[PDB]
Amino acid sequence: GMTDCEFGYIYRLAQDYLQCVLQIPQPGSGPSKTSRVLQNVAFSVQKEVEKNLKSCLDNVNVVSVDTARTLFNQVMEKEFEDGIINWGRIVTIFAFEGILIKKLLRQQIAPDVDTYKEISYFVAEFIMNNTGEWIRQNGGWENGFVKKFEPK
Amino acid sequence: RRVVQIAAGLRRAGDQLEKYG
Numbered sequence: 001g002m003t004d005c006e007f008g009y010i011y012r013l014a015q016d017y018l019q020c021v022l023q024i025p026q027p028g029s030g031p032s033k034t035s036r037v038l039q040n041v042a043f044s045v046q047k048e049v050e051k052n053l054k055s056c057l058d059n060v061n062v063v064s065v066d067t068a069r070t071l072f073n074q075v076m077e078k079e080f081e082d083g084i085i086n087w088g089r090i091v092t093i094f095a096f097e098g099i100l101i102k103k104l105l106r107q108q109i110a111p112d113v114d115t116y117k118e119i120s121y122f123v124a125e126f127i128m129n130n131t132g133e134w135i136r137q138n139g140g141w142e143n144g145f146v147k148k149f150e151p152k
Numbered sequence: 153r154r155v156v157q158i159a160a161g162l163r164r165a166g167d168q169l170e171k172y173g
Contacts, residue, residue: 088166088170089162
């Protein structure tokens with residue numbers, strides 16, 4: 001719905017996707033329909049990007065949450081600098097946070113179990129502040145994203 | 153350079169997914 005472009009909803013999507021990547025399913029009601037659709041599409045993109053950019057991603061060391069945040073923001077700035085927003089690009093934001101959390105799992109100097117909650121936070125900040133209005137104008141997650149990507 | 157390469161790879165993948173998804 002229209003409120004799904006606010007921070008809390010986006011944060012939950014970003015956190016759900018990281019928990020998917022880290023293989024830690026949380027008990028309870030289960031992920032939303034949006035999150036269920038997003039996890040499949042984002043993961044497919046993530047594995048493609050990990051293959052296409054493997055030589056490059058191996059030359060970056062994600063050793064702290066602060067390095068993950070700076071790198072994420074640097075990459076997002078360049079990805080979106082042409083002013084174009086579309087649902088495919090929004091999916092890649094989740095794919096990239098999944099790449100970052102996997103690198104952190106291996107490389108983080110002082111690992112902390114709450115790190116994926118910090119990553120999710122700065123991902124939601126970027127999505128809301130830089131794409132939130134476009135998301136709302138295009139139907140939000142329920143009437144835009146899910147309609148584009150759910151099964152036929 | 154690595155920032156630019158990663159960003160360009162993500163942009164390309166997203167624009168491809170947009171048209172083929």
